[PDB]
Structure formats: structure tokens, C-alpha cells
Amino acid sequence: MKAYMFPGQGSQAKGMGRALFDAFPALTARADGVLGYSIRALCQDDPDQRLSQTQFTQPALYVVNALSYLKRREEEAPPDFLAGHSLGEFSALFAAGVFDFETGLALVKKRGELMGDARGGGMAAVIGLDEERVRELLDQNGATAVDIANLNSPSQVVISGAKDEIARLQVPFEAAGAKKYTVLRVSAAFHSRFMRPAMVEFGRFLEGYDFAPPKIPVISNVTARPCKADGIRAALSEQIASPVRWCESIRYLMGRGVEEFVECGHGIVLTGLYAQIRRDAQ
Template sequence: MSERSVFLFPGLGAYSPGALRRARRSHPQVDATFQEIDAAAVLAGAPPVSTTLFDGEPRSIRQLLAEPAEVLQLAIFGISVAVHRVLTERGARPHLLVGHSFGEMAALVAAGAFSLADGVTLVCARAAALRPWEGRGAMTAVGMDQESAGHVPGVLDEPELVVACLNAPRQTVLAGPPTALDRVERLAEVLDVPHARLHLPYASHHPTMRPAVADFVARMADARQLPLQAAVHSPVHGRRYTDDDDLKQALAECLVLPVRFTDTVRSLHSRGYTTYVESGALNTLTRCVEHTVPGVRTTAPLLDPEEEDAGLRAALTSVARPRATPIQAEEEPVPSHPAPAREPEPTDVRPAAAPPGRVPPPVGAAPDREHLVVELRALYAETLEYPPELLTEDALLEAELGVDSLKQTSLLGRVADRFGLPAGAAELPVWELPTLRHVADHVAAAKARR
């Protein structure tokens, strides 16, 4: 069986400050993509996003969350589409495209099922349909397998909790009321299970979101579905899309149905898909793939903002192949229409985000910084069971040492307890603290503000 390649389109957690700033200098597809997105966004009544991404100092996800929802969402969508354009226009030939929840819209645009302008319409329609639900729900990723996570609602007597997303064998996302997720996180602390509240204002992939489905479909009315030019597999519907599908309805159903990314990866791997490229920022999905089917080839071209050109070259090499006909039968035959929706035996999005690379550290490092690094190295080495010599102050915790973001979030909680940091000091997104040096400077600055 020949090797096959997959482009992965991540969801709403896939934002990295400074993404594509270096790549746009040598890849005109980046600016061309965002010029189209800006024009369509203005027509849709949304702000342009290219200035947000490329002008001034890179902005954090917290800063973008304070903007209208469309800004961050169009940025993430645009980054995914731009990466796909850069790679395919330079000769990349992936066999299959896979979107994770929100990422399905970028995957379908990349596959030609919608124009880029209509893709903007889809993103804005989704944001508008979900606006009434903001603040009514939330999501938490926990370091548990599906079976263990499935028992949590019963153990806590919280029937509104659902398993919203299966990302990896030991990474599951629960969705529900914020108060119920508070209890989940307290239970995780007691069990010493890594956990992280996701940067989302609602409970995606939850059955109570059903009223938003019809609203989303209505708002997409002007978007025109086109013939697919590449194969797209949906982890929500559990199969490849076809031209007979009503893709707008399928996208709307993604609001309430679970995302079974782990099942998708295992199924694809069994059929010879052994190369996976993250078409977006960070390495959220490629890390999930590595945890699910170790030994495959993965590339996350935008993981390190300082090495984007090298990352794109590596991705291009991994998926180059002779041009084929638009859609070949890369999978076994599938029915013409979406399979009947499984009852939301929930599953959802947004894998915990990974660090973007070498970000400037916070200002205000205290004089005892060297001592802080020594203490942090000891704490991290003990918790991770790593040799201390591996934990140099500039080693990238995720990209080089393989410490996933759930574990990093848990470690930041221990750091806050160890150093008596003020409330909220452990809530900084882990991708803003990619090395022990950054963690030490963050601790020093937090102590100085007390």
C-alpha cells in the first residue's frame, strides 16, 4: 500500500502571534489571500484582519478575544487557507484534507467546494449564529481517555456535561455550563489529571446548541456550493464528503455533533495515510496524530515563527507527488448522503494549543531569575520525570521536549502554588511561555507586581 498524505485544518485554538509574518516576505500567496478575505469581510460587515495580523506588534489571543469574534476567527481561517495555497501552488499534492470542527470550513474552501469569499461568509455566519450563546457554556480539555471522561458527568451528577471532542487517546474535551466545568477542573486537580479551560465563550458540539443550527444555515444562504476539487474527510460525520452532500447543512450540524478526531486518524492510518501536515498555526493536530498513531511523519510548518520558510519547505517535501485527477478514490466507497447523525455522545474541538516558538519574554525579570530557573528546572524534571539536563532554559517545551499543552497548563498551576503567585497568574496561555526562560520571567514579573 502506497503512502498517502493528509493536510490538517485546525480549529479555533490555532492562533499564534506573528504567524505568517516571515513567510509573507517570500510567499505572495499570503498577502493575496488576506486581501481577498479583507474585501469579503468588509462586505459582510466585519473588520478587515490583515492589519491585525501583520501591522504593529504581534497581538496575543487574549487581545483578539476582546475584538469582535470574526476578527480572530477570520485570522485562523485565513492562516489555514494561506498555508494551503503556498504549499499547493509550490507543488504539494496532499491526498486528503481533514478539518477539525471550525477547520472544516477552511478545508472545504481549500478543496474548492466554496470560493474564498464565500468561505468568509461561512465564518461570519457561524460567528453570528453563535453570538446569542456566548457566556452560556464553555469547554475544558482533560488528560483522560474517552471511557474515563465519559464517566465524569455521572460521577459529578452534572447531566449537562457532554464529551465534546476526542482529540487523542488521552485528550478529551468536555462541554457544558461553566459551573459544571469548574467542578470538572477541581476533580482533575484531585486526580492529578492535566486540564485546561479552552478560550471559547460557548459549549461547542453540545446538543443544547441545536437552535443555532437552523440560524447558521439561514445565514449561509448566499454561499454557493461548488464541485469538490479535492477529497475532504469529516471527523464529525465520519466519512468523506461528496458533491451530493448539502455541505452547508453538514457544517451546521458540526455545531452540535461530536468531533471524533482520534477515530479518524486511526481509520486513515489503517488505510495507508502516514504523512500529516498542519495547514495552520502551531502543531495542535499533528501532536494529536503523533499520540494516536506513533511513527507517522508529521510537519507543522508554522510552529516556530522564526523558521516559517524552513517549515514550509519541509512540508512541501513531505507531500510532493505527481499531479492526479481532481478527486481519486483515496478511500473505500461511501454513501452519497451524510450518514445519520449519531446522538451527541459528545465530542468537540479545540485541542489545547501548542507554543508558537521563541516569543519575546515578559519584561520585569527580577534579580533572582537564575535561582528561579534552577527551581523551575527541578520542579519540571520531577513532575515530567525528565533528566534535568534536558530542561535547558531555552529548550522549547513542546516542539523540542514533547510536553503537550495540557501538561504545561498543569505545570503552570504548580508553579503558581510553589511561588505563591497572585490569582490568575497561572492562566496565561501556555503558548506564550514556550521555554523555562519565559516561565521564569513570568514568575519574576508576577512576584514583582504583588
């Protein structure tokens, strides 16, 4: 079986989606209408240097992921399962028919605005340590304001919380054997308790939207299991202040018999994670 994997924040780059805008000119124009600016120009030229600011990154990723999906739908056999990383979950739900293209765009426009307005905290990506070793290090070094934001592969974990704690933890994490400890160039501590105010506001916004049953199964970042229609709205606000359970989601798909994992969107970030998950699981 086959799964499509939709990338999120950090995977964007100038030049993303270039051939897709001319292949889907109506949807491109309709995105411009929702957003109030040219999505082609943002992705191709990045003239205001804002492709790395999440209020803009999120719509960019959603559009490129959506058009990438529509191209695969025209050209290849359908996927058996869908999963997306954080922002990518909205791409997955669009692919599953939970909402249409413009509705998803409106959701991610708001998501990006709320997350972009958040103040407080930072994040670090860690390579070479497993979840339990990361938790042990947080406890042993008294970092009480740091959460696990992403569980990406058995050796790749992203932590999120108080800026000072994120800074001072580099030394003990490297001493423990972290191959790399990278403070992310991000505006706030995403997927942590620092997002609780944004979660509440996003939940209130989501009250005004309905979510149709998925036509292709979508694996939730919150549960690492298939979404159910009645729980989608609530999980979408929960997700922003909860860990992204990506490694477990891919392992669940492997256990269902998925052997082909295809990234749908720009770049190879999720492809790299898949390679690390596969090696460990086999």
C-alpha cells in the same frame, strides 16, 4: 499517501501568517474587503486584542490556513486527503474546491459572529483520560448538562456545558488521574447542546449557498469519514452542536494508507495530536 490537517480555534497566535500576506496580496486585499478590517493587522499586531474572540479568530484562521494551503500547492506535490478541526473544516473544503476563497470567508465570518454571540456555558480540556473514563465521570458525578465537544486523541478530550458543572468536575477528574484539566478561556459551550440555537440560524444562512463536489477527499468532523457533496450543507450546521471526531478521522486516514500528516496553517496543535494518535494506533 499524504494528508493536510487544518487547525482551528485555540491555535491562533499574534504573528501568525506574517510572510503569507505579502506572497498573496490580491487575496489579502479581497479578505479585507469581505471583513471590513485589515487581516494583516489583526494577525500581526492584534491592536484591539481581539484575536482570541471567536468572531475574529475564525476569519484569521481561515485566511492563514487558505494562504498556507496555496503556498503548499505551489511548492509540494498535492495531498491525497484533507481534514480540518472545527473551523478548519472550512479550510479543508476550500482546499478541495467545494467553494472559493471569498465564499468560504463569508461562511466563516457568519459562523464566527453566531458563535461569538452565543451566551451560556464553558469548556474544559482534559489530558490523560479516555472517552469512556470521561463519560463515566460525567455520569458518576451527576453532570447532566455536559457534552463531549472534542475527541482529539486517545488521551485528549474536551468537554463542554454548564459553567458550574465544568468548574466542579475538575476535582473528580483530577482524582481519577487527569494529568491536566484546563478551563478554556472561551465565551460559550461550543460543540454542545448550548449551540443548538446558533445551529438553527447557521443552517438557515447556509440554505443560500451551494457546495461543489470535493476534488480532493475531505474527512468530516461529524462522521469521521469522507464528505459527500449532497450532505455537506446539512453537516456544516450539525457540526457546531456535535462532537468533533478528530481522533477517529486521523485513524481512518491511517487505515487508508496515509503515512504523512502535515499541518497546514499556523502552529503545531494538530501535529501534537497526530503524535498521540499514531503511538496508540501502532
